[model samples]
Target: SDVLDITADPTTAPQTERMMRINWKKWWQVFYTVVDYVNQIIQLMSKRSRSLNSAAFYYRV
Candidate 1:
């Protein structure tokens, strides 16, 4: 469960608004990093599985 504490209201305090903006930026930075890593791993897994499938087909014939 993720706690979303980045709600910035129009009447909110300036400090809180600024802090929320910084937090959102940092969070997105981390999110992008993780997504990139997952994408790389997924690509690698798919490529390996494809080669393995080809090898299995060759052996089964």
Candidate 2:
């Protein structure tokens, strides 16, 4: 008789599909967090430059 260790397997078979889904969701959350921070910085910069005339605002955009 022989014993097999599933944890030592190197490949993620179809049974692990659920785990892959969770990993992708976590990655998406991290990516969105960075995007949100960048948008916040751009909004702040736009607000601070409001004193400039329309010509300067067009250049900024």
Candidate 3:
């Protein structure tokens, strides 16, 4: 079992709509941070998985 965003920025994120004002750049940094995390996880878990096809996991936005 695992957790992930399983799911945006200014124009796409609509900062104005959010009570929390996260600027677009910061938002993207966060997005890429998770991307990087998933990347590292795959590499880190590569040996744990039986094959390279894929792995099972779960998460919520």
lDDT of each: 0.75, 0.74, 0.63
Write candidate 2's Cα lDDT for 1-61 as tens digits. Answer: 2366455767756766878888998999989989998688667778768545543666778
Q: What TM-score does model 3 achieve against the real structure?
A: 0.41
Taking the tens digit of each residue's C-alpha lDDT, what string does model 1 give over 1-61? 2365655546556677778989999999999999998788678767787556544666867
Instruction: Please say which candidate is ahead in lDDT: 1 or 3.
Output: 1
* Models sorted by lDDT, best on top: 1, 2, 3
Specify the poorest-scoring 10-residue window by lDDT in model 2. 1-10
Cα RMSD for candidates in order: 10.0, 8.9, 14.7
Q: What TM-score against the true fold does each predicted structure earn?
A: 0.40, 0.46, 0.41
Measured with C-alpha atoms, the lDDT of residue 23 in candidate 1 is 94
lDDT for model 1: 0.75
2 versus 3: better TM-score goes to: 2
Order the candidates by TM-score, highest first: 2, 3, 1
Candidate 3 accuracy as lDDT: 0.63
Candidate 3 contains a number of clashing pairs equal to 1
RMSD of 2: 8.9
The most accurate candidate by TM-score is 2
